[PDB]
């Protein structure tokens, strides 16, 4: 049902790729047509590296299935259902009718369950080798233009799922907190009544010769 | 058998590409169908440069076999088994039936043993020209952002095979030990009760003008 | 497939008997013949207490199944498939042909799924009541010969899964760190340029009357 | 040939279970009847834990072969050679005639080769998990009677392979060198012109109340 | 013969692409089938730029031969041997039978000798325009991380042909000698009893702000 799909998405929305989703997946799916499961796959939030590695793994295993099983056919009378092939197990190249015709036919060749095993194993691989990134993990290096940082922060911000108040509040907090000590000092040098442009301009002053000269002079001044 | 496969994997798991695996390979395999051996190949831990050079060598030698042996056929009556070709020796393009049909047929043309010789020689080439990397070998250059270092260390960490306690213990130890003297000093400047974020922020302060100015000032201060 | 087996082994290799393996197991298996599953059982790393308790639980439950279900047969004409018995559910005493003949026959009596439930429950019991041991957990008591300790440490070391550099590095670190304060003092009494033998001999001197006399005398010296 | 057997023994005599014997084994054997190979097994120097683990592994793998392959026979006319069984692959229960009759018959079912693979894998397991002990590794604990030590040393001495001069020379050297500092001091308290009995008696004095009292008194004396 | 091939390889092993190999080539080959010569080509140590330029030159000259000689055929009765084409002169696209059939046929069209002339000219071009690199020629620039240098040195080391003692001896010597004066000073600042890791760490300290500040301070100190 659609609510099951939304439920899956809800399971994916949080605790993403924690050692939870695999059994929840296997427990929620309980078998499906390869198309419906491929839909249950593609209906997610559209992750990049995860789904990349997913299609990779699935494709490789499909190729392995293709290699291991030649399953030559013909010249038998076209009265039978042929046989599933590694590319056929995928949602592509196949139709629901023959799929039901397969799953219904006996012996019960489990193409969908095998695909489920495949996507499960792949999902496990992803769970192991994938490390997600949050907005709190965004920080600027030792020296970079603040423009790229704020741009990166905003573009990264809109990618994260949250409310508006949570968004702009976190924007404020993380933006002022996660800045480099230098820029942070230059930002905190004045009262927090300034807008973004002012801080950006204050940060635009950074990186220039006058900055380094001023800091170096001040350093040698307080030192000597 | 599967345990033989797992045993091979176990032999590959440690002492990887030491002057051990070649005879152990030849001694464990004791001949196989090209498909089963190709499986015994692809069933490994999924190394990159090794298997790259492997497929490279195999492909080249296959091409050499193709070039050296034209072995034209026809117009003989299709009552015989044809002849193996360089691309046929590989697991691809071939089926187990004709392979057994070949190995069983006399004179005993050894396609699998030749492929074994090929993969052996290739594996030797790999053994010679491949230098593996451990987690202990991970170190940061003279000046780099600590973010890339910790990210590299973690992503490199999860790639290495070990236990959880061993993992995070080694994480702690190698992370604090393998740091640059500067960052290491900045890290050891405070008691080791801080989390990763604190050290990251302390390392985020590095690379800026204030840092260099402070160190330079301190240097000229202790000098003059 | 073999890769599924290696995948299971990989799942067992780390996070062993954490609240992960049960759903992963049930999700990866998706049902199997009792023989293939018994293979999937015996193909593991060869744990002792776990598999012990496993065979125990399975045997007990099998006995319970034997007791609860007399299922007397005869004198029916030998045209039917008989019925599964508790000892028959196990991989032993049974053949794949009749097993497929059973699973294929209707009503679909689920012997393999029941065995899966059994091994699952047993695996859960193991997950609950089993505490694994690492190399870091190895420590010598208040007074023992260092020989037994280093022997235990080495024999315990080779049992743990890791790389060579990781092995000998951990060997060094854990060996020097996990020693008793006394022996550790006697070990750190000299520069860490000595080999194992020197430290062993230094530790061989411990426990004798001269040692206790020296320490006691020194104690009474610094006291009085 | 016998010289091949003696050569194998010679290969076993030194570098025992180093990462050498496996290729040398597989290369020297070049296939054999299970009886002749079982002889090549039992003809060794009669090691304990190694051969123990060997028979263990072989028996387990044999049981696995028994389980995996029911290979039911009958009611076929007794004109054929039956089929090898896991217990049959071993030197026991089988005769050379049927073995040659098997290996000669086609398709060439490789029983001896499989047994070779088995003993190879087992030998690898032994190579990994077995740590041999030398005479140099013999040392007395913190406090033990010297009688047990010299007895252990002698009984351990005769077990090691060497010449007579090498034996008694090593006896002298290792006996005087590997002793505990206390006993070593008591031994070196006099010129090395004494026989074993004198040192034994001198060591017999150790462990008593007078000894500990004397050492403790001397300690407190040099201290206070 | 094979020894002639190994002899060629031996001629290539040293004095590579010196004004020697061309006449030695022409004198050793003394004509060959294009396949055997193409083998005599590909059987070398697998050089990169040389063989690159070689295939380049050969391909270009082949294209020139293709352009200059249209040599249209047909509709002659297929009783004759056709004619060699630029792509046919190469080992590819041709078989030994027709090649011998050509060389044997009169007038003696010299395809192999022409190919020999081609590869000779190409080899001359290579001799002129190719400058080989040794391990002694490996040096680090004014400022680079020592990691890349040692990695480059090792990977370059294993590429060079020499013995083990020669290898590691040259490793030591060239590694300590070819280092930059700065790093060399930092390396020679301590006794040459340190391992690679220590020097690497000492070199890891280089490039940072503290380094430059220290050197600059010391400079201004000794200056002022």
Swiss-Prot record, chains A, B, C, D, E:
It comes from the Viruses. Phosphorylated possibly by host MAPK1; this phosphorylation is necessary for Pin1-mediated virion uncoating. It is found in: Virion. Changing residue 158 to A: Does not bind FG repeats of human NUP153. Loss of infectivity. Changing residue 41 to S: Loss of infectivity. Changing residue 23 to A: Retains infectivity. Forms the conical core that encapsulates the genomic RNA-nucleocapsid complex in the virion. Most core are conical, with only 7% tubular. The core is constituted by capsid protein hexamer subunits. The core is disassembled soon after virion entry. The capsid promotes immune invasion by cloaking viral DNA from CGAS detection. Host restriction factors such as TRIM5-alpha or TRIMCyp bind retroviral capsids and cause premature capsid disassembly, leading to blocks in reverse transcription. Capsid restriction by TRIM5 is one of the factors which restricts HIV-1 to the human species. This is Capsid protein p24. It comes from Human immunodeficiency virus type 1 group M subtype B (isolate NY5) (HIV-1). The chain holds residues 148 to 371 of 500 of the full protein.
């Amino acid at each position: 049902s659609p609510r099951t799909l939304n439920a899956w998405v809800k399971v994916v929305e949080e605790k993403a790729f924690s050692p939870e989703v695999i059994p929840m997946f296997s427990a929620l799916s309980e078998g499906a047509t390869p198309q419906d499961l491929n839909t249950m796959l593609n209906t997610v939030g559209g992750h990049q590296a995860a789904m990349q590695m997913l299609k990779e793994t699935i494709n490789e295993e499909a190729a392995e299935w293709d290699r291991l099983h030649p399953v030559h056919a013909g010249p038998i009378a076209p009265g039978q259902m042929r046989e599933p092939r590694g590319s056929d197990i995928a949602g592509t190249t196949s139709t629901l009718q023959e799929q039901i015709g397969w799953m219904t036919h006996n012996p019960p060749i489990p193409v969908g369950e095998i695909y489920k095993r495949w996507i499960i194993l792949g999902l496990n691989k992803i769970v192991r080798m994938y490390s997600p990134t949050s907005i709190l993990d965004i920080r600027q290096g030792p020296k970079e233009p603040f423009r790229d940082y704020v741009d990166r922060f905003y573009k990264t911000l809109r990618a994260e799922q949250a409310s508006q108040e949570v968004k702009n509040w976190m924007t404020e907090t993380l933006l002022v907190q996660n800045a480099n000590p230098d820029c942070k000092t230059i930002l905190k040098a004045l009262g927090p009544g300034a807008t973004l442009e002012e801080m950006m301009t204050a940060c635009q002053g950074v990186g220039g010769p006058g900055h380094k000269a001023r800091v170096l002079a001040e350093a040698m001044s307080q030192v000597t």
